[PDB]
Each structure stands twice: as structure tokens, then as C-alpha cells.
Coordinates of N, CA and C and ligand atoms in Angstrom, one line a residue:
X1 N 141.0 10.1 174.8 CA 141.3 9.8 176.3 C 142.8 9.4 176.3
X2 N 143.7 9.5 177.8 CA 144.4 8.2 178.1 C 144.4 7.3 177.4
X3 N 143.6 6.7 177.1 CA 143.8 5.4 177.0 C 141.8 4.8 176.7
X4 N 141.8 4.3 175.8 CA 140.9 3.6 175.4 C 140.8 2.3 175.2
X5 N 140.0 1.8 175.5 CA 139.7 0.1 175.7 C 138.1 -0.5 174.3
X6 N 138.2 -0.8 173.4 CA 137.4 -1.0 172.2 C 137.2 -2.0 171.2
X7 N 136.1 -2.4 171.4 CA 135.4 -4.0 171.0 C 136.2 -4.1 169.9
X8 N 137.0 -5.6 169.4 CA 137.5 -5.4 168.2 C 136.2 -6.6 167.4
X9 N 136.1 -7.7 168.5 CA 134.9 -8.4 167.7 C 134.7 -9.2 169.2
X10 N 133.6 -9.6 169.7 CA 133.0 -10.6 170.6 C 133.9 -9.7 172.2
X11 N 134.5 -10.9 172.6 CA 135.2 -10.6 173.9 C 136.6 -9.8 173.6
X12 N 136.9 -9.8 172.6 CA 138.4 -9.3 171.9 C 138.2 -8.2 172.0
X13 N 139.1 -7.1 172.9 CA 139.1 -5.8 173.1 C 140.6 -5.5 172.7
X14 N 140.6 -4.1 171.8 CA 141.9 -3.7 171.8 C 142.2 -2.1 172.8
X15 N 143.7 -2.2 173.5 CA 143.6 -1.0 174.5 C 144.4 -0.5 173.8
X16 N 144.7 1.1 173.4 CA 145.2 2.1 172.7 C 145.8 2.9 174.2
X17 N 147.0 2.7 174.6 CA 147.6 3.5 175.2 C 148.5 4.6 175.0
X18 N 147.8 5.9 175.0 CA 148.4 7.0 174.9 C 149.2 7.9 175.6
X19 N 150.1 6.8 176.5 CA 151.0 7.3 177.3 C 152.6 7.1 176.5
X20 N 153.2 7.9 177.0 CA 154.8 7.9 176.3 C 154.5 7.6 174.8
X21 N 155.1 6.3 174.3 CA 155.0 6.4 173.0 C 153.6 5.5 173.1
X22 N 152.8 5.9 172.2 CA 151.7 5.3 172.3 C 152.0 3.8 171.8
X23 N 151.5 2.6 172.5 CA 151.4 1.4 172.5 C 150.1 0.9 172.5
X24 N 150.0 -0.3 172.1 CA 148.3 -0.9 171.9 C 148.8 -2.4 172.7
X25 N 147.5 -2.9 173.6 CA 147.5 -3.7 174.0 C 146.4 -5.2 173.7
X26 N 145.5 -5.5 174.4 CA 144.5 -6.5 174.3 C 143.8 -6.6 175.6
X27 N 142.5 -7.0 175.7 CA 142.1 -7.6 176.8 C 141.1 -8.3 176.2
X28 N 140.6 -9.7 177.3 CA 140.0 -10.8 176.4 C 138.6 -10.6 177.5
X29 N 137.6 -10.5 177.6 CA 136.9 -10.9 178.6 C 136.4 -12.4 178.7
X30 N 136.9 -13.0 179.3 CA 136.3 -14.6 179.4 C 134.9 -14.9 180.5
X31 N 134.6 -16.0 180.6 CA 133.4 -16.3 181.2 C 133.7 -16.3 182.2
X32 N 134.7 -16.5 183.0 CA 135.1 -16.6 184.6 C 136.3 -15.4 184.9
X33 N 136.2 -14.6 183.7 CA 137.6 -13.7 184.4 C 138.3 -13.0 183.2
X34 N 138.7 -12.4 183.2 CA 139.5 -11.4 182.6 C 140.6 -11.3 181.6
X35 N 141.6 -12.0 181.1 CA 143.0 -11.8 180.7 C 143.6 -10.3 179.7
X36 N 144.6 -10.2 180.2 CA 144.9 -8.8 179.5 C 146.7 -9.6 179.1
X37 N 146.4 -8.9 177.5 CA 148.0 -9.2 177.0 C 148.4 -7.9 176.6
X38 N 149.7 -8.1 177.2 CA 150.2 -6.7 177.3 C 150.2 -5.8 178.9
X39 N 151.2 -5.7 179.8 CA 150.7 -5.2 181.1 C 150.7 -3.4 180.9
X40 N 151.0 -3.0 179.7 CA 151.1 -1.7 179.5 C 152.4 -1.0 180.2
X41 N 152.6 0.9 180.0 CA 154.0 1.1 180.4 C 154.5 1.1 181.8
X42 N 153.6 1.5 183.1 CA 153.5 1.9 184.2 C 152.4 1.1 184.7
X43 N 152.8 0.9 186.4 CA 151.3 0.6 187.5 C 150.5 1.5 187.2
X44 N 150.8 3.4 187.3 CA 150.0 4.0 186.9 C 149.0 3.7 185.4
X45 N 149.5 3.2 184.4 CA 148.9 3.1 183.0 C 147.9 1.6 183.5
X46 N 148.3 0.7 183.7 CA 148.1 -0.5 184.4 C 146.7 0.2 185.8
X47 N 146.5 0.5 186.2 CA 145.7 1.3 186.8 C 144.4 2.0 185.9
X48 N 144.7 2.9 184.9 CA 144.2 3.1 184.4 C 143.1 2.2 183.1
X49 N 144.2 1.2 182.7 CA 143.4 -0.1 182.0 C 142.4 -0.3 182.8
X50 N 142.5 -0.8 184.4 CA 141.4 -1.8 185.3 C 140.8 -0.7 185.0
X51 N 140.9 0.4 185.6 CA 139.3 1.5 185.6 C 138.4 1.2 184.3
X52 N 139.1 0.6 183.3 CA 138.1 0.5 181.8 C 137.6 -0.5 182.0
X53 N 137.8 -1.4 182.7 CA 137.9 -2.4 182.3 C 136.8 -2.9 183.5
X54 N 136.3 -2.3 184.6 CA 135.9 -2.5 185.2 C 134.4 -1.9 185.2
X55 N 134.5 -1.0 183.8 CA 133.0 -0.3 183.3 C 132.5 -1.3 182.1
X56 N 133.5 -2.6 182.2 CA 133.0 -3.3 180.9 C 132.6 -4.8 182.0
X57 N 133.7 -5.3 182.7 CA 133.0 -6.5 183.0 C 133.5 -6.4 184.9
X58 N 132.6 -7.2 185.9 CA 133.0 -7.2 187.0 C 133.5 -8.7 187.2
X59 N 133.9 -9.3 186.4 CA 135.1 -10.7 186.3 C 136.2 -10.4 186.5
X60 N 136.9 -11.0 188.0 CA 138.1 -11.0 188.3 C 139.4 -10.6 186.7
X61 N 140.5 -9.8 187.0 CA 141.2 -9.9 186.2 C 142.4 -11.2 186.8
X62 N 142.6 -12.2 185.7 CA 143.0 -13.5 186.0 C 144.2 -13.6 185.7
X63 N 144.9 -12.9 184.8 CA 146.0 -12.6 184.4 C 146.4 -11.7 183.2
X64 N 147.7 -11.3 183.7 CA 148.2 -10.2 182.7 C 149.6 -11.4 181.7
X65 N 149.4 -11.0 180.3 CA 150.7 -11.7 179.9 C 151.6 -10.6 179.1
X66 N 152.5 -10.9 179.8 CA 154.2 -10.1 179.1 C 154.1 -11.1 177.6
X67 N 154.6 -9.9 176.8 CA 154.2 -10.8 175.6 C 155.9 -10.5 175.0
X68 N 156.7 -9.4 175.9 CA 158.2 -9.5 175.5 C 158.9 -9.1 177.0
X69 N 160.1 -8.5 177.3 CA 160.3 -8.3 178.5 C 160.8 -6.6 178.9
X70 N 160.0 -6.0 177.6 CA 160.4 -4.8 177.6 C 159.3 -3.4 178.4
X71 N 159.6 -2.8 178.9 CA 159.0 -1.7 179.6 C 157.3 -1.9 179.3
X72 N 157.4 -1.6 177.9 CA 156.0 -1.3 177.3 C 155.0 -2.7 177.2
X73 N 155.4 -3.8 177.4 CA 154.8 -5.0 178.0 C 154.4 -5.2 179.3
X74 N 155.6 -5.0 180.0 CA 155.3 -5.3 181.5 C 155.9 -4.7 182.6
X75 N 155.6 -3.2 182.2 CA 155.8 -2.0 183.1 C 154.7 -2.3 184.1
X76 N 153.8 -2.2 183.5 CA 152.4 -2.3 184.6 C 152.5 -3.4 185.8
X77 N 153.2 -4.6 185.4 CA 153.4 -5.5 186.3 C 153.3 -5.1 187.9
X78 N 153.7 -4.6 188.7 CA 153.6 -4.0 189.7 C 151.8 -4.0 190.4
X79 N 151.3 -3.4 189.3 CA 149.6 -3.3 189.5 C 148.9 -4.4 189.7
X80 N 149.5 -5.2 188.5 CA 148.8 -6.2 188.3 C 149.2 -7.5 189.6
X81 N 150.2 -7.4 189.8 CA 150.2 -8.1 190.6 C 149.9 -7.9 192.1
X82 N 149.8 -6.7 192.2 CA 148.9 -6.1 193.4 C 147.3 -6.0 194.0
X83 N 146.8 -6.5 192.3 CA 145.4 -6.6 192.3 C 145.0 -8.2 192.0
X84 N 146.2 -9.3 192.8 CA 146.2 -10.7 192.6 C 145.9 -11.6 191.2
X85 N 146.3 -10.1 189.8 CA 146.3 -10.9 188.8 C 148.2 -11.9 188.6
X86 N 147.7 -13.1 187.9 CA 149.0 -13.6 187.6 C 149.7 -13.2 186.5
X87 N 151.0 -13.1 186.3 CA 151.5 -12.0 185.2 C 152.7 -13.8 184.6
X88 N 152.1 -13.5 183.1 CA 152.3 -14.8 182.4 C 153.4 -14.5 181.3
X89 N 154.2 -15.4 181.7 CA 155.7 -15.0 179.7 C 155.6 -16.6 179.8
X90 N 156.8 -16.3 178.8 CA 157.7 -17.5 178.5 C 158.6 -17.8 179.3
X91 N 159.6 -18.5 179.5 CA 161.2 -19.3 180.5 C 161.8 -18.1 179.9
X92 N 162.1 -17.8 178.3 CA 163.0 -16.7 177.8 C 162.4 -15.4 178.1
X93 N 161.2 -14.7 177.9 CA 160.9 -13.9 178.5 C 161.3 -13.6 180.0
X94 N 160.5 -14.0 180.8 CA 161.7 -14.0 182.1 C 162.9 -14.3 182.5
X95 N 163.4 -15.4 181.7 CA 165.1 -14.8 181.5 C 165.9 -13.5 181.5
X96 N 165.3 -13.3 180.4 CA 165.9 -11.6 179.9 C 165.2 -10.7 180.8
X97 N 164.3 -10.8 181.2 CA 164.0 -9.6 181.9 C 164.8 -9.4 183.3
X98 N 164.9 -10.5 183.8 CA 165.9 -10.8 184.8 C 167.5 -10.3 184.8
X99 N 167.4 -10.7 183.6 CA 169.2 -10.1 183.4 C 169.4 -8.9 182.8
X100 N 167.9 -8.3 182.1 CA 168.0 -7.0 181.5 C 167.3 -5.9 181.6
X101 N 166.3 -6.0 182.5 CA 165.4 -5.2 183.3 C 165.9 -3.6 183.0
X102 N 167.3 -3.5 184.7 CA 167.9 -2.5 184.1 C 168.1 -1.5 183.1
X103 N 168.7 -2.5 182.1 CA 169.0 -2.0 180.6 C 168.0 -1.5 180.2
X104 N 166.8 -2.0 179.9 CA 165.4 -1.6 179.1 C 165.1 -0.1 179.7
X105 N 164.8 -0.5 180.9 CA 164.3 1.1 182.0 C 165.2 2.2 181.6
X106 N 166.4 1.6 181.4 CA 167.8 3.3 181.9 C 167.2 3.5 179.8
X107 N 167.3 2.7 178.5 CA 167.1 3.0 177.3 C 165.7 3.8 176.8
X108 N 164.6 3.3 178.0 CA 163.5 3.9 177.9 C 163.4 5.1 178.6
X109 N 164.4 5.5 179.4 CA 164.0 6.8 180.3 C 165.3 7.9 179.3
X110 N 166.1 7.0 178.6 CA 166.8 8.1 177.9 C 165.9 8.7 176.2
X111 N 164.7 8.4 175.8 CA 163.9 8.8 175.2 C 162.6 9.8 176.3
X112 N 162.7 9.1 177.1 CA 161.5 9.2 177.9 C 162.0 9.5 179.4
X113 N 162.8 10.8 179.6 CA 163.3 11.0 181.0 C 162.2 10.9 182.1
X114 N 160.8 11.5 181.3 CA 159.5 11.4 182.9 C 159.3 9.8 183.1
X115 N 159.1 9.1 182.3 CA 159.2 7.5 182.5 C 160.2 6.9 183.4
X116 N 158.9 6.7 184.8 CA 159.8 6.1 186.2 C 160.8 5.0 186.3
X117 N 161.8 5.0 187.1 CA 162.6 3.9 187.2 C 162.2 3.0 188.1
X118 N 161.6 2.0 187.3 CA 160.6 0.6 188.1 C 161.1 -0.6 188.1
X119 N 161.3 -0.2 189.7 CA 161.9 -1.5 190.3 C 161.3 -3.2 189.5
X120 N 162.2 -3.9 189.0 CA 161.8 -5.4 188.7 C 160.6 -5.9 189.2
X121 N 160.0 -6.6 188.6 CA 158.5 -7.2 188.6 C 158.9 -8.7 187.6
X122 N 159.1 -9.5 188.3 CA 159.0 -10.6 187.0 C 157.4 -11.4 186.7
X123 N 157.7 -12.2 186.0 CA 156.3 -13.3 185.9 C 156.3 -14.2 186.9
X124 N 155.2 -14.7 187.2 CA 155.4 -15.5 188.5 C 154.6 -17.0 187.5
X125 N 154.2 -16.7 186.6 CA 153.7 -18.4 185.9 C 154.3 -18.2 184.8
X126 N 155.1 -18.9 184.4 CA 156.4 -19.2 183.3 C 156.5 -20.5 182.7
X127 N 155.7 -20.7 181.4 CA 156.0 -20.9 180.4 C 157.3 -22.0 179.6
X128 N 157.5 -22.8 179.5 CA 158.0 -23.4 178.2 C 158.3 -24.1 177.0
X129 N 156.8 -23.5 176.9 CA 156.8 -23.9 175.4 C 155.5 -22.6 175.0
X130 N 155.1 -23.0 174.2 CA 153.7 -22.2 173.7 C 152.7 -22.5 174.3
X131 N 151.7 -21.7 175.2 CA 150.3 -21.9 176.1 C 149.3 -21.0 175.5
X132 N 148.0 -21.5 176.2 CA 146.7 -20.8 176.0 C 146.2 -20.6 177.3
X133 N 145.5 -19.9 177.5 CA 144.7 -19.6 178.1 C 143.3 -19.3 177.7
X134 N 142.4 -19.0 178.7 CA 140.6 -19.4 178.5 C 140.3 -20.1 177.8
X135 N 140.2 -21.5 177.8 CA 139.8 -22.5 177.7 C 140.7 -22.9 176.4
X136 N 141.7 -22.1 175.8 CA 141.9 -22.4 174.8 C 142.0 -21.3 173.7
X137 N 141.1 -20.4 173.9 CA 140.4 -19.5 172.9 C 141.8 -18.1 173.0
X138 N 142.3 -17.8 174.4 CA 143.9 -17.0 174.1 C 145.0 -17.6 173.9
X139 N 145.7 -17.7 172.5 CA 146.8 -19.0 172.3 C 148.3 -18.4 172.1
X140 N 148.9 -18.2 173.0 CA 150.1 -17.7 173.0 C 151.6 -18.5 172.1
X141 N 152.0 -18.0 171.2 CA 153.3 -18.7 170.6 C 154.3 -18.3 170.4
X142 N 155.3 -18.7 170.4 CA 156.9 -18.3 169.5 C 157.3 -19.0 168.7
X143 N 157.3 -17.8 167.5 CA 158.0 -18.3 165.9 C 159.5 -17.3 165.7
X144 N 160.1 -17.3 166.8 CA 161.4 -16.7 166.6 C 161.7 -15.3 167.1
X145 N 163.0 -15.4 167.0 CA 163.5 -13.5 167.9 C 163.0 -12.6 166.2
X146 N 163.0 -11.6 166.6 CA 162.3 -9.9 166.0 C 162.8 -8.8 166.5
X147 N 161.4 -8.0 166.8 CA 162.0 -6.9 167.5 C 162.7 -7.4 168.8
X148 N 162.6 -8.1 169.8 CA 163.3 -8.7 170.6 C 163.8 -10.3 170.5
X149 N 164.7 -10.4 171.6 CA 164.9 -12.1 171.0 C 163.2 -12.9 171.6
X150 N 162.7 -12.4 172.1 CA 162.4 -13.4 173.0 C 160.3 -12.9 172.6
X151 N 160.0 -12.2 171.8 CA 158.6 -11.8 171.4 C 157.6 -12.4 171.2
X152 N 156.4 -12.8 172.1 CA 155.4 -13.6 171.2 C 154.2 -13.0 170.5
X153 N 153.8 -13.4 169.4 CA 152.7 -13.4 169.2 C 151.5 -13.9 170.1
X154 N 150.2 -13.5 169.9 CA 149.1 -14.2 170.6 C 147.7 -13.9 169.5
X155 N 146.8 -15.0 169.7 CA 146.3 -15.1 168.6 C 144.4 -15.7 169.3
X156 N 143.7 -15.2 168.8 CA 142.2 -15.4 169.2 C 141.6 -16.0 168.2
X157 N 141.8 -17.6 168.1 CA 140.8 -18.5 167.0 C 139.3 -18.2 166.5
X158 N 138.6 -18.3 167.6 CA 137.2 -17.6 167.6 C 137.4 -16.7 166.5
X159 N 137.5 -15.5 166.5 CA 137.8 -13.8 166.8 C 138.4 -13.7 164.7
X160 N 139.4 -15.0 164.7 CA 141.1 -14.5 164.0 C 141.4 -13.2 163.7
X161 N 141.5 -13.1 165.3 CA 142.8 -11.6 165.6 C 143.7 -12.0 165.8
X162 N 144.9 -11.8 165.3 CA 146.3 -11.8 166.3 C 146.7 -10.3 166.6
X163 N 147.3 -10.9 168.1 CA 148.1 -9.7 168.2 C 149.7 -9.5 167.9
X164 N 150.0 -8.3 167.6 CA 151.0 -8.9 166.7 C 152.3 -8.1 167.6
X165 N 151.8 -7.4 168.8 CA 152.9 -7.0 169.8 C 153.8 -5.8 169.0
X166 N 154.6 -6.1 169.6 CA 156.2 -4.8 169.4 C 156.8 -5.5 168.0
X167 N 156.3 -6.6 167.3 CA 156.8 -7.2 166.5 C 156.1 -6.8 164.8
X168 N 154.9 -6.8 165.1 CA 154.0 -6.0 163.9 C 153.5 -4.7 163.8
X169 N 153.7 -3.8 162.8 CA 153.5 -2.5 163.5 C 153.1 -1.7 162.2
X170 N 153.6 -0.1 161.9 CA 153.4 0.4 160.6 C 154.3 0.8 160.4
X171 N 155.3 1.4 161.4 CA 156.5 2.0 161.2 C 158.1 1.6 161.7
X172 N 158.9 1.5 160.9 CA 159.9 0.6 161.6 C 159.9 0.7 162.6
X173 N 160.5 1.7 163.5 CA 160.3 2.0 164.8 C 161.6 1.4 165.1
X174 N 161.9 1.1 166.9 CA 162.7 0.9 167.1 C 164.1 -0.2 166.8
X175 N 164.9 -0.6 166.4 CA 165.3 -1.3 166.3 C 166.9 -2.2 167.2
X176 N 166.8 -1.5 168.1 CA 168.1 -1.7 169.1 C 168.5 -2.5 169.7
X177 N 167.4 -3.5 170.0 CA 167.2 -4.8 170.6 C 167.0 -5.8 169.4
X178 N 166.5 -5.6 168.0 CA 166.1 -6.7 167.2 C 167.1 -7.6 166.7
X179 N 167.2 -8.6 166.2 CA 167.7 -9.3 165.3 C 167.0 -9.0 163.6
X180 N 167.9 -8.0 163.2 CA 167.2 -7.8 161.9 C 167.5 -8.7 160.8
X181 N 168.5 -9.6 161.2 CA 168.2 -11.0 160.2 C 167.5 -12.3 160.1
X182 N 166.9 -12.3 161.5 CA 166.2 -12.9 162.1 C 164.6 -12.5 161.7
X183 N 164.5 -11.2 161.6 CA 163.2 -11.1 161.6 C 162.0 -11.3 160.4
X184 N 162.6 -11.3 159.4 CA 162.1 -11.6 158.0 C 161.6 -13.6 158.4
X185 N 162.6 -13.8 158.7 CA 162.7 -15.3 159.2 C 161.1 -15.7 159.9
X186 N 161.7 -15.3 161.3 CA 160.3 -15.2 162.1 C 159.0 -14.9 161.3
X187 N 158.8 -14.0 160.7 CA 157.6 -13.5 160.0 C 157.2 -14.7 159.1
X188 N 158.1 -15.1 158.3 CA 158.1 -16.2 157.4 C 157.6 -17.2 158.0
X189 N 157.7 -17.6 158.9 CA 157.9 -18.9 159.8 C 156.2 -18.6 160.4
X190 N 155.9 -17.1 160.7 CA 154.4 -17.0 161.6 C 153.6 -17.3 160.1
X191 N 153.5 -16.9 159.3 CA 153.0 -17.1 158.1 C 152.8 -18.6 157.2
X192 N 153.3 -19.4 157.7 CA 153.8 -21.0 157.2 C 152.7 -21.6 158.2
X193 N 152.8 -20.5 159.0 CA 151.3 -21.5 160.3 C 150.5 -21.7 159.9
X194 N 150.2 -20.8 158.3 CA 148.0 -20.6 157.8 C 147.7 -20.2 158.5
X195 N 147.5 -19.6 159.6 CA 146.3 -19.8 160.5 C 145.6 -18.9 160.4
X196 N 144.2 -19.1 160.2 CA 143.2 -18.2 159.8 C 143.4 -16.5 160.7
X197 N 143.4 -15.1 159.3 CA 144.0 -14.0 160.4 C 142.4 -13.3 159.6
X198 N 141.7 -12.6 160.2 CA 141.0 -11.6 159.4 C 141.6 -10.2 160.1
X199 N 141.8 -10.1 161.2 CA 142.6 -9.2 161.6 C 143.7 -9.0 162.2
X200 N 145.0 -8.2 162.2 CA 145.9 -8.2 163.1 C 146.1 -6.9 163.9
X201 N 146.6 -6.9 165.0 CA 146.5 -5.9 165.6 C 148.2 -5.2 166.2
X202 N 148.7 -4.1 165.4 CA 149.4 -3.6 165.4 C 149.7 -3.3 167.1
X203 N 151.0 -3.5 167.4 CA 151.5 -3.2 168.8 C 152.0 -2.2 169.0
X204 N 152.1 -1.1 167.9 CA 152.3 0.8 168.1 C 151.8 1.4 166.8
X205 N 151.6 2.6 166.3 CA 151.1 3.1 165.6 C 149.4 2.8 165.6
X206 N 148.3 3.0 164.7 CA 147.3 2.5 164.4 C 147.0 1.1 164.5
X207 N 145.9 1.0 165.4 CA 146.0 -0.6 166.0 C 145.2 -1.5 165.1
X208 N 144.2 -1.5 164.0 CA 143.6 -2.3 163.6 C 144.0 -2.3 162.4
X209 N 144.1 -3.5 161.7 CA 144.6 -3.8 160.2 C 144.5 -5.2 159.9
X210 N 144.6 -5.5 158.9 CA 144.5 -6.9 157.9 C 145.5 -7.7 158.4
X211 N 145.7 -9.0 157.3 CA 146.8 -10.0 157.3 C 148.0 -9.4 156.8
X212 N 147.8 -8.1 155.9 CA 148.8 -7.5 155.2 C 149.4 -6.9 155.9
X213 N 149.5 -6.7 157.0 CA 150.6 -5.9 157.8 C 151.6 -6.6 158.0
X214 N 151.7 -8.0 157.7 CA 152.4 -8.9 158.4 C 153.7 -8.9 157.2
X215 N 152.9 -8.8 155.9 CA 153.7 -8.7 154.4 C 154.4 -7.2 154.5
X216 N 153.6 -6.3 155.4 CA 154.3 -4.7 155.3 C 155.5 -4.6 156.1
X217 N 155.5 -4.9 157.4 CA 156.6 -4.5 158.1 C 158.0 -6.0 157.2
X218 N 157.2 -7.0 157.0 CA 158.5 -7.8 156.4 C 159.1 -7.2 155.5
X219 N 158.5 -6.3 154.2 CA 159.5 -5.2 153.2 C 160.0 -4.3 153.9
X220 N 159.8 -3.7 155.1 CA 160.1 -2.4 155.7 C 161.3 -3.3 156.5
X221 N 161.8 -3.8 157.1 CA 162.7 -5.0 158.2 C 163.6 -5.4 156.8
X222 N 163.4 -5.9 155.6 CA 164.2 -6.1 154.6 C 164.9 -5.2 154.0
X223 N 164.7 -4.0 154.0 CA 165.5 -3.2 153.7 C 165.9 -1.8 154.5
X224 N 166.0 -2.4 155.8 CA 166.7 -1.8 157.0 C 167.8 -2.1 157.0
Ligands
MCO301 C1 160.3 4.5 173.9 C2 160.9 3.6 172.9 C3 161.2 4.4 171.6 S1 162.6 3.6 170.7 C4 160.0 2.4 172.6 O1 159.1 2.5 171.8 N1 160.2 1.3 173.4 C5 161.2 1.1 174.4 C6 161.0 -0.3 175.0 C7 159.6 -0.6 174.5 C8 159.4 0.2 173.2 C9 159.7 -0.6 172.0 O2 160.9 -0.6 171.5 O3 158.8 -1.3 171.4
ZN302 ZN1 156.9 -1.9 171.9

């Protein structure tokens, strides 16, 4: 399909979006409502999520979280906030997006010329410091700039999935935006946390994998 939506364990769903460059997302189903991390590339892709997502549970979608400030996060924004979900970052995440919106759109339409030029959408609940949402059980953090300055991880205790965003992946992939001295750092730094991983979930290429992905892309980032 488009796009697939797929039990990773309990409420933990991972979304495989096969639009432009294929991206992976999340959606959590909670007891009173919805959360999706990641808003995907487009309203259209963002559209297409709810249709899944609405053969799986009829709990309000509660919010969407930008988990960096780039296209493939929080393109969909538009949708979601159309369909009275709240669209969640950090103070730095919405910073940059604010001042670099532009930039991201014109970089992503010069790989991807059919990729629309989408007017700004920011977050409207912002963040400063590290939050959770559903009772606790979606726990959003920053351990430092990566592929962007401003990237979070997010992490499901219950579950131990993390998601590991535009930050964890199989293949270098882009690098234009990162701090590639920084990034070994950060990884170092998410790893110092312990925190129980049985799974992590890659944010492009093949979406399900171990703790070791986290040791893979850090040798691949070290000798870029
Ligand atoms: C389409 C490009 C290829 S460099 C891409 O994968 N982008 C552009 C912004 C979001 C995403 C990324 O770098 O993770
Ligand atoms: Zn990405």
C-alpha cells in the first residue's frame, strides 16, 4: 500500500509511508484518544494515516508530535490540525521551523519537484523541556542536535520501543542539515540513559530493529 499502519507490540503501531522518500512514523492508541508521532510528508499523506487509523480505533486523534521541523515530520500539519488534533514540538523545534520552513520545502522540492510548496503550519503546544504524553506511557526527549539541531527521540516504556526519527536509520542518508560532530555525541549521550530498548524503530529505510541500530548508524556518522 501507500502507506501501512502495523502492530509493533500492544498500542504501539508503526506507519511505513511510501510517499516520496519513504519515511516511518508511529501512532500510539491510548484509552481516551489517539497520539501520532510524526505528522508525515503532506495533508494528503496525513489524510491518508487517519483513513488507517480510523479502521483501527474510533478515539479522537489527540495529537500529532513534530519530532524535528523538517517536511517529513510535519508536512501533514495542515490536516491535523484541521481535524482539531494538537500538533506538539519542542521551543527549538518551533523556532526553526519558523525561521526555516522555507528552506526545508524549496531543499525538499529540489529532490522531490512533485512535493507541494506548503504554506507554514507551526505547533500550537510547545514544549520546554522534555514531555510525555498518555498518561506518561509516550515520553518525548532531547539528547542533543544529529541529523537536525533540534531532533527528538520518543520512547514507549510499556512497549521499550523507541522511536528513533530522522536520527536513527540504516543508511546514512541525508546529511545537510546535521551536525556531524555532534552526532556520535548525542547517540552517546541517548545510550548513557540505559533505558530499557527491545526495539527501535528506524525513521527511513526498514522500520523495525534492535538496540543495535543505535551502535550502527553511530560507526556509519563516524566515518562520514
Ligand atoms: C527528500 C530528502 C532526501 S535528502 C529527505 O529525505 N528529507 C528532506 C527533509 C526530510 C528528509 C530527511 O532529511 O530526513
Ligand atoms: Zn527524515
Amino acid at each position: 500500500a501507500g502507506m501501512s499502519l502495523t502492530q509493533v507490540s500492544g498500542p504501539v503501531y508503526v506507519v511505513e509511508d511510501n510517499y516520496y522518500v519513504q519515511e516511518n512514523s508511529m501512532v500510539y492508541f491510548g484509552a481516551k484518544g489517539v497520539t501520532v508521532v510524526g505528522a508525515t510528508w503532506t495533508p494528503d499523506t496525513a489524510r491518508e494515516l487517519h483513513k488507517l487509523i480510523k479502521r483501527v480505533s474510533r478515539k479522537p486523534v489527540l495529537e500529532v508530535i513534530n519530532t524535528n521541523y523538517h517536511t517529513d515530520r510535519a508536512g501533514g500539519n495542515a490536516y491535523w490540525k484541521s481535524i482539531g488534533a494538537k500538533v506538539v514540538s519542542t521551543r527549538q523545534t518551533r523556532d526553526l521551523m519558523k525561521s526555516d520552513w522555507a528552506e526545508i520545502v524549496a531543499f525538499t522540492r529540489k529532490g522531490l519537484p512533485e512535493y507541494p510548496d506548503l504554506p507554514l503550519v507551526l505547533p500550537n503546544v510547545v514544549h520546554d523541556g522534555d514531555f510525555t504524553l498518555q498518561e506518561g506511557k509516550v515520553r518525548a526527549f532531547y539528547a542533543g542536535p544529529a541529523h537536525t539541531p533540534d531532533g527528538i527521540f520518543v520512547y514507549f516504556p510499556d512497549e521499550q520501543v523507541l522511536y528513533g526519527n530522522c536520527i536513527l536509520k540504516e543508511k546514512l542518508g541525508n546529511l545537510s542539515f546535521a551536525d556531524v560532530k555532534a552526532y556520535p555525541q548525542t547517540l552517546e549521550r541517548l545510550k548513557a540513559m540505559k533505558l530499557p530498548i527491545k526495539t527501535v524503530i528506524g525513521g527511513h529505510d526498514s522500520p523495525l530493529h534492535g538496540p543495535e541500530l543505535i551502535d550502527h548508524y553511530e560507526a556509519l556518522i563516524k566515518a562520514a
